[PDB]
Structures are given as C-alpha cells and as structure tokens.
Design a protein around this ligand. Structure first.
Ligand code: MG
Lengths: 240, 244, 906, 11, 385
C-alpha cells in the first residue's frame, strides 16, 4: 500500500512503516523501569537459554551511555546499536561545549529527534526499537524516567513497561505502585520489580537482570544471590 | 501477506520482518559448513571446503580462512561476491586502530564496527544487506581467546562453540552432546574431525576437502601463534586421527 | 513352561523375561503328585506371592495370557487337594488374583460369565478366616504404587456387587443363584463388604453407590452408616464427606419400594444431623413430615450458640421458607423459651418477615394501577377480575378499588369474583382489609360471599404471626346458614392459615357442612377445606372425610360435578406420603360402584408413590383399556360413564407428576419425553382423548415443573389455537408464568391478539384473554411458583386449586375460585444478623436445561449478579454463594435452594 | 464397572 | 459418570413403555372407517387413477380453470375439478394433476424438492454446551448475539433495539469453531439447516442462483432457525478460477447471495453462522455489520485456557496424578488447543509401544517432545532477529 513511501503523506494519516515498527518492539525482550524516591530500578530480561554460549563476552542489554545515564530497550538488537552510538557521542559532546554534565532531558529529545528525522527523509527507515532512558539531572537527586517511541516522540511516566507480555506487567504496576507515592525505600522498590519480571520469565536467576541506578554516578547491578533471595521470599507468599 | 514488498530496505514487509534479510539466511546456508570451537588452550578452526572439483585447485585456495592480522583470523561463509568488500575493509580498519593506539585491536571492537556497516545498508540506502557470516577467532588480553559470530542483520552474540552455513543443526546436536567443558586443544581437533566426517559427504573426510588452522596459546613461552596448515599437514594428521 | 522341572526357583529368573511361569507347575503338578509336597509348596508360598506383585508392576495383556495355562484350572478340588485342611486353604490366596486377570484385562466374554461363579466362592470361603481380607488389603492401600492394583481392586469388588445383586434378581437369592454361588449375608462375606467400603470411600467416588443400588435393600446402607460415621472427619474433612453422602443417597433411593424408599431418607437425615451442616438436614425433615424429626433438627441448630448471632436466625429462616408453616410453629417455643428477644424470633420464624421483605421489593419493580380488559358483555365481568390477576402479590391499586362504581357494574355471580380479586391486589398482606370489610356488610348475598373469599386470599401473609387472625373474621359466617356465604368463608380459613396446624383451625372445621342435608354443590368445600390443613405433613388420612364422601355419593349421583368435587379433595388431602394412603385405599375399595373406581384411580395415584416401578406401569394399563373397549365395537347411567372416562385421563398425568417430584431430576426430562410422543398416540386413539388430554397437558407442564421451557410450551399453544378447548390456555400459561416476561412475552402477543380477532363466542374470548393477561406480570412483579420453599417440587397446598378445576367443565362459578393463586417467591438477599436487605453478590446460571444435574450440586460457573432477584424456575434456580471479597464462609450452603443467603462475614 | 457396561449396550 | 447411569435407567423404561402403548394406540383394531373417513377414501380411489404427473400452477383465472405447465413442453389449460379450495391455491404452488385428463386433484407437495431434505439437518447436535474445554469468554459472544433474544426477549424489547442478524466465526482452526457451532445449536433447539458452499460451484447453468433463493425460503418456513453457510468463502472471496468455465458461474452466485443477505431489509429472525478461515488477508465479501453484526475472532489458546481442556483428558489416564500437570502446559509456548488434543492421542499410542496399557509416569513427559517438535515444524512462526 503506502508502505512503499514515507514522503507520501497518506489520507489514512498513518504510514504503515510506522505501524510495523510497533510489531518489532513487541517481539523483543521485556524491559521494565519502576522508580523510587532516590532510585531507578531497571529489571529486564536477558535470554540465556542459548546452548554453548559463553555468557561473559555476550553484551548485557543494559549499556552505559554516560556515567549516570543508562539505557534498556525492547526491539531488534541490530537497529538498536545505532541509537546507542549516536547517544554516546552526543553525551561527551555535551560536556565538551556546555561543560555541564549531560542534561538527561536534552538527551531524551536528541534521541527521539533521530527516529523523527528519518520519518521525514525518504530512503531511511524509522527504527523499530522503543527505549528507556533513565538518569539523574545535573545538580539533582530526583530519579528521571523516560520512554521514547518509534513514532518520533517522547514522554515521561511514573513507571512503564515495554516489550513481550507487557499487558501482564501493566496490571501489576497499577496495583502495587502509585504515581502519588513511589515506594519510598529502595528495597521495597526492587522487590516489586522482581515480582513483575517473574510473571513472564517464570523463574530465572540470570534471566533476570537488575541494575539500580542511584544519583551521583552510583551504578551497581544486583548480585545473583541477592536476586535469588527476592525470588524465594516472593515464592513463599504465592502458596499462602 | 500476499503482496510481498521488499524492493528497498526502507520499505517494510507487512510482517515487519524484511524479506531481503530473510533471503540472506538462505544464502548463508547455501555454502558448506564451517566450525569454530574455542578451547582454553587455543582456538581450533576446521571446515569443509566449498570447492569439490579436482581440476580447480582446492589446495592453494583457503577460501574459508584469511588472516586479518597477526592475532586475528576469520572463517567466512556466504556470498563470495559480497563478502570480498567486507574482508578487505576489516584488515584496513584493524591496521587503522594499531596506528592510533599502537595496540592490537580488541576482538569485540572489530566485530561491532563491521556489524554496524551491515545495519548501515538497511538503515539507509536501498543497497542490499551484504548477507555474510563470519566466525571471528581472535585473542585479546581483555577476555583471552574470544569467539564471535555475526548475523547478516548486523548483530553478534558470543559463543562457546558455533557452526555456520549448511547443516548447522546436525553439527550443533553432536558438538553439545559430547562437549568437554574445560576443552583441551588436542581434544578440540579430534572432536572437530569427528563432527565434520558425519556432515561431509565423504565419510573418509579426504584432506583435499579440508581446510584447517590452529591458533595456540599452547605455543612456547605462553604466546599466540597462528599456523595455517597446508593440505600436506592435514593429510599427515588425518592418518593420526584414523578416519582414513 | 508347564514342565515338572519349571517348578524350581532356579528358573524364576530365566523365565521372567517372557512372563513368570514358575508358579504354573508349582501349584499344579506338585499338589496333584504328592501331598507331602503341599507342605513343601507352603515354604514356597512366600516366593509365589511376590511374583504376583511383579506382574502388576507392568500391566499388559501378554503377561497374563502367557503366565496362565493351567493356573486357571487348579484352585483346590481340581487337584483333589484337601489334605492337611490348612494347606490348600492358604493356596487359594495366590490363584485368586490369577483368575481375575484373565477375566477382563485381556478382553474375553466367555471367561467373564463362566469364572464369575468360581471366583466368588474363593473370596467367601477364605474371608471367613479373614486372610482374604489381608490379600485384598495390600493392593487397596498401595504401599507399592503401580498400575496393576488399580484394576485388580476393581475386580474383587466387582464380584461382591454380583453377590448382592442375587437378592434383587431372584427370590431364590443367596447361593442358589449361581451367577456367583456365594450368599449375600453369612459370617464371612459381610466382614468383606465393610472393610472394602472404608478403604474405597477414599479411593473412589462411584463404586460405593454401585453396591448400594444393586442390593436394593436398607441392609446396604446399615453397614455404610456405621462406616461413614467413622470416616466423617478423620479420613477426609467434614464438608468433603458431606458431599459424598448427598451424592450416594439420591442414586440409590428412586428405585426402591415404598417401605424402604423412606428408609434411605431416615438414614440420610440422621447422617446429616450428626455432621455440622444441618442446612441439608432441615430439607429432609420437610419430606418425611414427622413432627418428631422437625423438633430434633431445629433444636440441634439452636443449642450450639446460646445467643441470637447467626444461629437462631438460620434456624428461623430455614423454617420460614417452607410456607406450609408447619415447621414455624414447631420451632417457636424453643426460641421463645431462651428469650433473647421474643418478638423478632417469632416474626422471623413466622411469615411476617416474608411480608416485609416484599414491601421493600415492590418499590423497585414499581407500584402500578395498571388494568387490562375490555368493556361490554362478558368482558365487562372480565376486566374487573383481570386487574386483580395483573396486580399479583402486594401492590398499591388502592384508588381504583376505592371507586364502588366498577364493583357494582359487574353482573351476576361475576360480582362474587370481583370482590375476591380485590383481595388478590392485596395478596400476601393484611393492609387492604378495610376495603373488603365494607362489601361484607352491604348489598347482595353475592358480595358477602365474595368479601370472605377475598379476606382469605389476603390474610395468607399470616399463619404464625398471629397478628390479625383469620379465625376472628371467619367464624361468624359459618353460623349464617346461607350456603354461598358459608362456603366462601370455610374455604377461606383453609387458605389463610394454609398448611399450619393450630387449635383454631381444627375447631372451626370440626363441624363440616358436607352432607346430604344440603344437596348443593358448595357444601363439598368442607372436606376440601380440610385438605389444606393436612398437606405439607404426614396425613392422618382422617376418616371423617371418607365417611362423608360415601354418604353424599351414593345418595345423589345424578350430579356428577358434586361428587367429583369430593373425590379430588380426598386426593389432595393425601399428598405428602403414600404409606398410610395404601391402608385407606382398601376402605374405599370395599364398597364398589363405577363411581368408586373414579376415586380408586385418584387416591391410587398418591398411594403407589414411593416407586416408579409399580406406579408408572399401572396408570398405563388403565390408559390402555378405553381404547380397547371401543376398538372391539368397531370390529344416573350417563353420570357413571362420564366420570369414569374423565378421571382416568386426569389420573394418568397426575401419576406421572407424583413420580417426577419425588424422584430425581433425570426423571423430569424423561417423563416429559414420554409425554410429548404420547400426545400423538392418544389423538390417534380417540376423539375424546384428544380434547381432554390437552387440558391436563398444560397441567403436566406446570406440576411436573419442567426443565425445558423453550420449544415445548410454544409447540403446544400454537397447535391448540385451532383445536377445541381454550381451558388448555389457562393451565399451560401458569407454567409460562413462572418465568415472567419470557415464555409469556410470546404468550401475550400471539393469543391475546388472535383471540380478539377470530372471536365467535365471548365465553371463549374470556378464557383466552384471562390466561394471556395472567401469564404476564407487569415488569416482573411477583411470580407464583409450585415451590413451597426449599422444596421446588414440593407438595402444593394452595396451588392445587388448578388440579381441582382443570378437571371439571369451565363455569362462571369457577371464576371466583381461580383468583386464588397463592405461593409467592422470595427475593434472594444476603443476610447475616442485621437483616440487611438485598444481596451483595450471588451466582445464578440461567442456561439450565441439563438432565445430567441430578446430584443437586450447583452448576458453579454462573453469571454474577449484584441485584436481588426472585428465583426463576429452571432458568435461574442454580445458586452459588459469592461473597469472598470481605472473606466469608457459607453458614447456609445453597444447593440451588430458594433460600435467602446467609454468610459469616469476617 | 463391568455389570454397568452392559446397561449402555442395552440402551 | 454416575450422573450418566442415573439417566440410562429412565431412558430404558420410557422406550419400553411407549413401544407397548403404541400398538393399540396407533390402531391394530381401532380402524376408524366411520362416515367421515369413508367419504374421503371412496372418492380418492375413484378420481385418482395413478400415476399422477405433477404440475406447477402458473396462474388462475376465476372460472375454475387454471393454466399449469406440465413437465411436457406443451402446457395445458386445465379445469380445477374436485378437492383443493380455489382460495387455498395461490400462484407458484406445485400441484397434483390427474394423468387421464389433467385436472387439479389436490396438493400434498408445496414445491417439495430433494434439495430441502438434504439441507435439512436438524439432527442431534454431537455437542452439548460446555462439554467443550473452550473458554467461557469466547462462547459468551456467540451466545450474546444468538441465544440471548430467544431466552430473554424482555431486555431486547424494553431497550427497543433490534435482535442481531448473523455472526462470523473465524479463527484459527483447532479453536474448535465447529464445535462451538454445535454447542450453540444444542441450546437453542432451533431448526439447524446446513449447506456447504462448494455445492453452489458447478459449471451447470444458473444453478448457483437457484440454490441461493432456496436457502431463505427454507429458513423462514422452519423458523426459528440457525443457517450454517459453512465455508461461505467458497462462493465468495475463495476461488475456483475463471479459465474453467468460472467466468460465468462464480460472479452470479456471489452477487446472488450478497443481494439476498441485505434483502429489502434484514429478516432479523434467521440467525446465520458463517464459517471462513479468516477474512483478514482474504478479501471481505461478508458486506459490513448490521447484516452480520458482531464478528468473532477466537483467540489462539493461552496457558490458562489449555488447562481446562487438559483436565478433561487426564481423567481417563491413570498415573498422571504423580505427573505434574502444570509444567507440561507452561513449558510449551502458547499454541492451538488442537495441539493438546493431538498430544493426548499420541500419548496413548506411545504407551502401547513401551508396553504399558495406559500411560506410564514417564510416558507423559516424553509425549510432549514428539508432539511439540512435529507441530512447530508444520507451522513456523517468524524468528526474532
Ligand atoms: Mg471445523
């Protein structure tokens, strides 16, 4: 149909290539962000069911853009490699010219700008990745959560999920989290993200990856034994 | 669905899964088998040749195996025509990096950059994806011996052992079944020869149908020594392993 | 193989690939050859037993076919072994499973029949020692878990089922029945049944009622009784076992004859009483009707909690629902003695709270002054009456009634029916008495009779509130000798106090007016008045009524109609049990007339109830005989002939109904299926059967309380627009009425429009219009169903006005009686202890038509409703408790029961 | 089990 | 189980009783031959010499003559003589004519054709409701369109909304679509007509359009009804090509049914069940809602659905109580309900090769491997890239 054109504006008002991007986000891993008062917890699936895989050199889904800016993603791994690279360069650009450390909010916009640009320029596909960019603003200790979409726009939610079986996760996020009050403690906040991920992973120590990002360049990924500890405690409740 | 659209990379399939990429899989698999086994004491690269004519000189062609630099070698499977652009760029890029920092290229770097051109041709430019898979065999001191594979799509995944091109599934079922976790380098050669004889039409696995190289950390005083074995040393070791 | 070197234990191993066949010459040839070798076989007996366990680890047909070749022949007396009386006896134990294996598991018919006998002896003889008990036990308890035991244990018990079936099949019974050739009762077989049953309550749900029903005796439930009482809490929880009991009893009970039919109910009742749940138990107390039993359960409910809480409320409400009201009076005195509150309990046991809940409901359904009916001629009479029928239950229609114009504008006997129907506006409630009292003093004799009948209809909302007694009004008019006035009034007494027994009711009715002194038809109503009283509980089968039936019948038989009134009345009186109705069946049968035999069939229909075995067949030999007399001819005196023929047709449907109500719910679909094919058969058979059968067919549909309410009522109605008789519309439509604005939405448009159109007699018009309007209820205003309360197949008490009058020719005098239609249906409200009206949530499943619900276990899917809802016949009936949000447990556990909800809310 | 098989066959 | 036994006992005493009654009742001696019957009989033999060659009444002229076409190319201007009322006969009726001289001796036909009998398949639905392991939610969309006006006309009447016309079933085979069709059929107890759409694809001249008209007539006569036009797409969007004589037929049949589905107005008393695989990637020929109303897409079975289906099957099996049910369904991806059905059947087959009469504890974990591998090959889903 109109899938062969981008320039052609379409009376449907909807260019099919754009629709098809969404199909692509769905297929990918589930990646979730839930934020406290002092933390972003990012719980994400990393598949590891692959036989004869040396896990050490296989890239973790989470990639440090900046020293305090992180990215998780759902959608095609190849296409996603371009966003990570543009975004890294721009990170260091920011410091080189403003001196100021990376404004996260600029960065959210910069990234979306690329998925937008390519919607207008024929002969350049719109990317079929949606991302989570999360960070902490210069001179600030309030957590910051953003999602980008392949529609070439951006938005902030109090907590959000993307990728396979996101429908299932969204019910959890409505009932156990609230915009009004995020779980004040870091600890509360991490335990709920583990329970959400369990709904679609259905038991895995390394299939669940938790990276907690705190203010002031504090990045630490939870220990496999500690992750295992969240699971067992939760699993006792399930039969009660 | 019905009307399959795929003229350009930019034009999406209804499915959303670009058919040009799909056709790329077929092509890879067209070519014979290549196999990389990473061992704790070397890497072994062993493959059955594409060519089969005796008139055509199989012996002087190591179509599968080219070295890019002193530490890094690649096994190639797919489209010969397309492939030739990428092997050449990869050598120059490696030497560009050595110019800059006066250190050997890290394995991980060299793959990620090449994968990114492969994406480049779908991201922009009608230009077909250059549908080729390499198995990279390299060494760096960041992670030791490292093995990678690259998808035509333009993404990579590490592996403990992998097979590419034709009959990937059969060779894969055997490797995992008898896998020895530690892996000795002597062992890897034996194990490789067993897998190829079962997937190779000649079940006597003639030498003239074989390409072989071994990259060894088990080379004196703890160093990395790449050695391309000629058809005459393949033949001597064929009689050592006893298939003939 | 069979070799006399395969005896060794050396060859266990070499053989065992193929199948162990070491056993085969070891119990065959050794037994025969030497009797020193029976003692040797005893030492080898230990090995041989373990081989059986190995051949049940892998269950396959090959290793049973192959193992046995002559293990089948040799048992004891085959090999002529009997030596040391102990040895061959112990050698019965290994060869017993052997036979069971080749009978079934490898499929073979011949061996099933032939070895059925052999096998049962072996089990009986050795269970006396109690060492067959021990062979059974090791596979029953599965210490070693395998496929083998699961089919082996079924076999052992299959044979026991065989043994008790010998009692049922032949009078010879016992040993002499050689299908088994092993007695049903001994000193070795009995000790086997019990032991098996305990273990198998745990392992199976369905082998246990198999033994019960084929025995066809209460001997089967006595052994069970003691077992269930051991197994009730420890083996499995009180609630789960309680479920097992309710299944078991309903499967065995329809089959059995009248003296034992009742016995299965006494055993079940007693189990239920013992277990904590008495919700089911109160039900069983209604069915027998023994005063003794209602006292026992009722006290058992009240005694655990010495404060009102859930306990007293539960007791009261269970009794209330049954609007027989017999139970209510029994329950008050226990409650009144404690005196937590006197008044609230009396009200709540009594029917006063049922009046009050409806008042709340009306507001919702919307109070209407709506009337239907047309002016001029015999419709001028109708329109008045019809306002009554349309304003079913308690409703405001005060202002319409307040006009005296409409009432005096009625003519004739129609004036009588007008004042009675004003009572039907105010049905189920005292309030609206005042309008009626006015009529009672003023003008015509006709309206005085009408006033009294209507006061009856209204005062039904009491019988144990004892707030404005019926007796206060109704005494005075008995004394006035005018026949019309007295008749309305002494029938009235019957309706208002209903089923309830009270000193007041007996002493009013002790004088009867039924005599030859008033030839008048309306004197018959004394005996009819009596009939209300007795029903809903065990009958005295009072002799007073028998004496007066006979007197009047013989004396005047010129009027058939007089004596038909008397006959059906005795019939109604009898409902509720059959046992004592058998006894008085003889009294009537001693005197014989063509007239007597109208009575024989009717009272017989009640009498033979307690089995379908006799009842169903009998009322079909009777249906056959008319056809036969006529077909022969083809190839005072008048009054006798007419009665005979009409009663026979009536009795045929009535018997079917008695059967279905008492027996399981599978029997309802089934009787109905006979019934429909049956129409074609009776239409073929005769002209007279064609007309009459229609009239009863709509009554079959309603009394039977049919599941299906879709295709069949509509088939029948369409077909009888053309066919003579329009009294079929009346009877049918009261079935169509029980699910309001559904079956009846159809009814109104089709019948009410066409009836007006094709009009060619106003009398017919009246019949059609009255049924079609009645059937509808304005926006689901109260419905009249057969259900008495927890019974939904309950013996009718004030809805048998349809039974009386469908039978007899239509009349202007009938129109008065027909205003009675009392038996309204309670909403379903969650209650705790504060009586907060309306339900929180409950499940109803409105998709029922299934004939494979017979347990009484709700279809637990439902669709959830939050609004209070009336219980809709067979379209709404299944009821689940839903109140889990605030975390609750049923204290009243629904079984599709009409009953309001009760829960313990945490 | 078996005596109730033959009830189906008759039906 | 037991519930079924209780019913057998009643069904076998109903039949017996009926059969015996029947002799007398039908007659065997009753032999009505009194004045009313005798009249009919005497006359009927006299007037009717046989065979009787049927006609079609084309028109009436009031003078007790009619014009009929006989099967012979010459038509015949006939007298109306005897029996059938003049009024009762309306043009377009098929009629009995007497062979010696053609006269209207009556009607007993009403344009009886064998085609109507073939279509007529009210016969015992194999499904009762909720024998199926399907989900409450899917069946309670079909039920809402079809059942709910017949059972409760009160709500529809009160709202004032019209009763819906038609549904479309489409899935996904192995969602038990035709099972669903016969679940619905049982409940309604409506005259359940069935016709398959390939009988309307023929080279034969104009026969398709003739068949299309028949269907509307049949349903109306035997109303209330459900008309299963099964593989509606056979006529419609689905092909039989036009370089096979199809440049005549297929056009005429498609149009014809289309025109009658709208009609002068929707009938609103003939329910339809339209089967088709899906009309998502096929062209749509089922022409907009209001004549097909609610359209029903059955979900591909998720993990909770197949639990319910699975419970039916495990009942007969012995040694599957130790086997953990929950883990077999989870491990497999979400797939057809047909694939769980396939598994049960394979499972038993496989036990027999091991030599165990019914499944072993081991047999069930093994069963899953053979069925999953076969089915994933048969139907391959897009590989994540
Ligand atoms: Mg099908």
């Amino acid at each position: 149909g109109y899938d062969r054109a981008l320039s052609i504006f379409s009376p449907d008002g909807h260019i099919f290539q754009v629709e098809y991007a969404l199909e692509a986000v769905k297929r990918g891993t589930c990646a979730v962000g839930v934020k406290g008062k002092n933390c972003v917890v990012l719980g994400c699936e990393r598949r590891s069911t692959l036989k004869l895989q040396d896990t050490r050199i296989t890239p973790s889904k989470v990639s440090k853009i900046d020293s305090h800016v992180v990215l998780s993603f759902s959608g095609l791994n190849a296409d996603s490699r371009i966003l990570i690279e543009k975004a890294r360069v721009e990170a260091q650009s920011h410091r080189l010219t403003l001196e100021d450390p990376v404004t996260v909010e600029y960065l959210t916009r910069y990234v979306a700008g690329v998925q937008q640009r390519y919607t207008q320029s024929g002969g350049v596909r719109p990317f079929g990745v949606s991302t989570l960019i999360a960070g902490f603003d210069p001179r600030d200790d309030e957590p910051k959560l953003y999602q980008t979409e392949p529609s070439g726009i951006y938005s902030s939610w109090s907590a959000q999920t993307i990728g396979r079986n996101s429908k299932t996760v969204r019910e959890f996020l409505e009932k156990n989290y609230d915009r009004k009050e995020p779980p004040a403690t870091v600890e509360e906040c991490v335990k709920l993200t583990v329970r959400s991920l369990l709904e679609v992973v259905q038991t895995g120590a390394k299939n669940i990856e938790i990276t907690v990002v705190k203010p002031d360049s504090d990045i630490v990924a939870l220990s496999s034994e500690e992750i295992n500890q969240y699971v067992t405690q939760i699993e006792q409740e399930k039969q009660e | 669905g019905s009307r399959r659209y795929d003229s350009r990379t930019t034009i999406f399939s209804p499915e959303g899964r670009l058919y040009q990429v799909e056709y790329a899989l077929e092509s890879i698999s067209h070519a014979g088998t290549a196999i990389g086994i990473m061992a704790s004491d070397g890497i072994v690269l062993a493959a059955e040749r594409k060519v089969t004519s005796t008139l055509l000189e199989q012996d002087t062609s190591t179509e599968k195996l080219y070295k890019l630099n002193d530490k890094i070698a690649v096994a190639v499977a797919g489209l010969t025509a397309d492939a030739e652009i990428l092997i050449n760029t990869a050598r120059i890029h490696a030497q560009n990096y050595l110019k800059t920092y006066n250190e050997d290229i890290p394995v991980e770097i060299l793959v990620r950059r090449l994968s990114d051109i492969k994406q480049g041709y779908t991201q922009h430019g009608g230009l077909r994806p250059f549908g080729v898979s390499f198995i990279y065999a390299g060494y760096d001191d960041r992670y030791g011996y490292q093995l990678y594979t690259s998808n035509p799509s333009g993404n990579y995944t590490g592996w403990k052992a992998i097979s590419v091109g034709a009959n990937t599934s059969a060779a894969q079922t055997l490797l995992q079944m008898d896998y020895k976790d530690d892996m000795k380098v002597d062992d890897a050669i034996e194990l490789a020869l067993k897998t190829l004889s079962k997937t190779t039409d000649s079940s006597a696995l003639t030498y003239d149908r074989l390409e072989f190289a071994t990259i060894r950390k088990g080379a004196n005083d703890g160093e990395v020594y790449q050695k391309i074995f000629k058809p005459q040393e393949i033949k001597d070791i064929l009689v050592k392993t006893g298939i003939t | 193989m069979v070799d006399e070197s395969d005896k060794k234990q050396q060859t266990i191993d070499e053989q065992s690939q193929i199948s162990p066949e070491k056993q085969t010459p070891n119990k065959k040839d050794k037994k025969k050859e030497e009797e020193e070798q029976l003692s040797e076989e005893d030492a080898k007996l230990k090995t041989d037993l373990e081989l059986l366990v190995e051949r049940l680890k892998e269950d396959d047909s090959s290793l049973y076919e192959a193992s046995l070749n002559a293990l089948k022949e040799s048992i004891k007396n085959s090999t002529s072994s009997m030596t040391a009386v102990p040895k061959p006896l112990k050698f019965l134990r290994p060869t017993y499973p052997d036979l069971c294996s080749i009978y079934d598991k490898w499929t073979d018919p011949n061996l099933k029949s032939s070895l059925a006998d052999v096998l049962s002896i072996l089990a009986m003889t050795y269970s006396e020692n109690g060492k067959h008990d021990s062979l059974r036990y090791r596979l029953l308890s599965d210490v070693s878990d395998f496929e083998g035991w699961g089919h082996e244990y079924i076999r052992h018990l299959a044979l026991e089922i065989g043994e008790v079936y010998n009692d049922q099949v032949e009078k010879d019974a016992e040993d002499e029945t050689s299908s088994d050739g092993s007695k049903s009762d001994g000193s070795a077989a009995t000790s086997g049944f019990e032991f098996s049953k305990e273990d198998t309550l745990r392992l199976c749900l369905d082998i246990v009622p198999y033994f019960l029903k084929h025995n066809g005796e209460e001997d089967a439930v006595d052994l069970l009784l003691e077992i269930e009482s051991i197994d009730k809490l420890p083996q499995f929880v009180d609630e789960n076992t309680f479920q097992r009991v309710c299944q078991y009893m309903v499967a065995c009970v329809p089959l059995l004859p009248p003296p034992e039919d009742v016995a299965f109910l006494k055993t079940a009742y007693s189990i239920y009483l013992s277990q904590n749940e008495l919700t089911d138990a109160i039900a069983l107390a209604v069915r027998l009707g023994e005063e003794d039993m209602i006292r026992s359960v009722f006290d058992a409910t009240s005694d655990p909690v010495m404060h009102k809480q859930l306990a007293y409320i539960l007791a009261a409400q269970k009794t209330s629902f049954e609007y027989e009201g017999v139970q209510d009076i029994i329950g008050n005195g226990k409650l009144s003695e404690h005196f937590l509150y006197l008044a609230k309990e009396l009200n709540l046991t009594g029917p006063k709270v049922p009046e009050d809940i409806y008042k709340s409901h009306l507001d919702n359904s919307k109070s209407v002054f709506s009337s239907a009916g047309l002016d001029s001629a015999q419709q001028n009479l109708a329109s008045s009456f019809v306002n009554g029928f349309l304003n079913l239950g308690y409703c405001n229609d005060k202002l319409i009634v307040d006009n005296d114009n409409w009432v005096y504008k009625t003519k004739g006997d129609g004036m009588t029916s007008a004042v009675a129907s004003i009572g039907s506006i105010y049905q189920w409630n005292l309030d609206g008495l005042q309008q009626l009292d006015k009529y009672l003093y003023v003008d015509e004799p006709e309206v005085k009779a009408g006033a009294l009948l209507g006061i009856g209809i209204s005062a039904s909302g009491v019988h144990d509130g004892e707030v404005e007694p019926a007796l206060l009004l109704l005494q005075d008019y008995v004394t006035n000798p005018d026949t019309k006035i007295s008749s309305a009034a002494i029938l009235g007494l019957g309706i208002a106090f209903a089923g309830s027994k009270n000193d007041e009711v007996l002493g009013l009715l002790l004088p009867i007016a039924a005599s030859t002194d008033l030839p008048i038809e309306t004197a018959a109503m004394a005996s009819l008045a009596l009939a209300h009283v007795f029903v809903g509980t065990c009958n005295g089968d009072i002799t007073t009524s028998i004496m007066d039936n006979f007197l009047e019948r013989t004396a005047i038989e010129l009027k058939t109609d007089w004596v038909r009134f008397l006959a059906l009345a005795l019939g109604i009186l009898y409902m509720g049990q059959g046992e004592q109705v058998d006894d008085v069946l003889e009294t009537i049968s001693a005197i014989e007339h063509p007239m007597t035999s109208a009575i024989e069939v009717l009272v017989g229909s009640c009498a033979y109830t307690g089995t379908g075995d006799v009842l169903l067949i009998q009322d079909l030999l009777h249906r056959l005989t008319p056809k036969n007399v006529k077909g022969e001819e083809d190839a005072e005196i008048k009054s006798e002939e007419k009665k005979g023929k009409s009663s026979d047709k009536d009795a045929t449907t009535d018997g079917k109904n008695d059967d279905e109500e008492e027996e399981k719910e599978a029997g309802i679909v089934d009787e109905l299926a006979y019934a429909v094919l049956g129409i074609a058969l009776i239409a073929l058979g005769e002209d007279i059967g064609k007309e009459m059968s229609l009239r009863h067919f709509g009554h079959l549909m309603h009394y039977g309380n049919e599941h299906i309410r879709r295709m069949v009522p509509l088939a029948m109605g369409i077909v009888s627009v053309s066919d003579p008789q329009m009294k079929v519309f009346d009877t049918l439509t009261r079935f169509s009425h029980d699910a309001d604005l559904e079956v009846s939405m159809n009814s109104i448009f089709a019948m009410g429009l066409c009836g007006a159109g094709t009009n060619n007699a106003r009398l017919a018009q009246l019949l059609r219009q009255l049924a079609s309007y009645y059937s509808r209820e304005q926006d689901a205003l109260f419905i009249t169903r057969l259900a008495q309360g927890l019974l939904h197949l309950g013996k009718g008490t004030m809805t048998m006005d349809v039974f009386n009058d469908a039978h007899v020719l239509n009349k202007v005098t009938l129109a008065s009686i027909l205003t009675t239609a009392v038996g309204l249906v309670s909403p379903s409200f969650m209650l705790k202890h504060h009586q907060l009206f309306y339900m929180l949530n409950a499940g109803i499943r409105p998709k029922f038509i299934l004939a494979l619900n017979d347990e009484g276990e709700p279809i637990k899917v439902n669709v959830r409703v939050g609004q209070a809802v009336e219980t809709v016949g067979q379209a709404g009936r299944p009821k689940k408790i839903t109140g889990w949000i605030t975390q609750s447990t049923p204290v009243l556990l629904n079984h599709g029961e009409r009953a309001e909800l009760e829960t313990d809310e945490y | 089990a078996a005596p109730y098989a033959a009830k189906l066959k008759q039906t | 189980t037991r519930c079924k036994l209780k019913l057998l006992r009643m069904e076998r005493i109903k039949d017996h009783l009926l059969l015996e009654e029947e002799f007398v009742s039908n007659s065997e001696i009753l032999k009505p031959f009194e004045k009313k019957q005798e009249e009919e009989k005497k006359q009927l033999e006299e007037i009717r010499g046989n065979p009787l060659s049927i006609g079609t009444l084309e028109e009436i002229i009031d003078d007790d003559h009619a014009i009929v076409t006989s099967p012979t190319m010459p038509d015949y201007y006939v007298s109306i003589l005897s029996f059938v009322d003049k009024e009762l006969l309306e043009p377009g009726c098929s009629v009995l004519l007497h062979h010696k001289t053609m006269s209207i001796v009556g009607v007993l036909q009403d344009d009886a054709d064998p085609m109507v009998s073939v279509m007529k398949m009210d016969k015992s639905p194999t499904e009762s409701y909720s024998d199926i392991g399907g989900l409450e939610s899917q069946i309670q969309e079909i039920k809402e369109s079809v059942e709910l006006p017949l059972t409760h006309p009160e709500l529809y009447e009160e709202m004032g909304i019209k009763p819906p016309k038609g549904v479309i079933l489409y899935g996904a085979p192995g969602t038990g679509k035709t099972l669903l069709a016969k679940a619905v059929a049982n409940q309604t107890s409506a005259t359940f007509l069935r016709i398959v759409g390939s009988e309307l694809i023929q080279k034969y001249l104009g026969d398709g359009p003739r068949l299309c008209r028949q269907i509307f007539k049949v349903a109306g006569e035997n109303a209330p009804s459900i008309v299963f036009i099964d593989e509606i797409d056979a006529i419609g969007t689905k092909r039989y090509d036009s370089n096979s004589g199809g440049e005549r037929e297929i056009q005429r049949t498609m149009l014809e049914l289309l025109n009658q589905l709208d009609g002068f107005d929707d009938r609103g008393d003939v329910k339809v069940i339209m089967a088709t695989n899906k009309i998502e990637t096929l062209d749509p020929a089922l022409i907009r809602p209001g004549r097909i109303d609610r359209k029903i897409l059955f979900e591909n079975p998720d993990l909770s659905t197949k639990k319910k289906i699975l419970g039916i099957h495990t009942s007969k099996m012995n040694l599957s109580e130790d086997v953990n049910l929950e883990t077999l369904v989870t491990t497999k991806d979400d797939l057809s309900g047909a694939d769980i059905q396939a598994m049960c059947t394979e499972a038993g087959l496989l036990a027999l090769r091991e030599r165990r009469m019914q499944v072993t504890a081991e047999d069930f974990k093994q069963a899953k491997e053979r069925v999953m591998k076969n089915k994933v090959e048969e139907n391959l889903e897009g590989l994540y890239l």
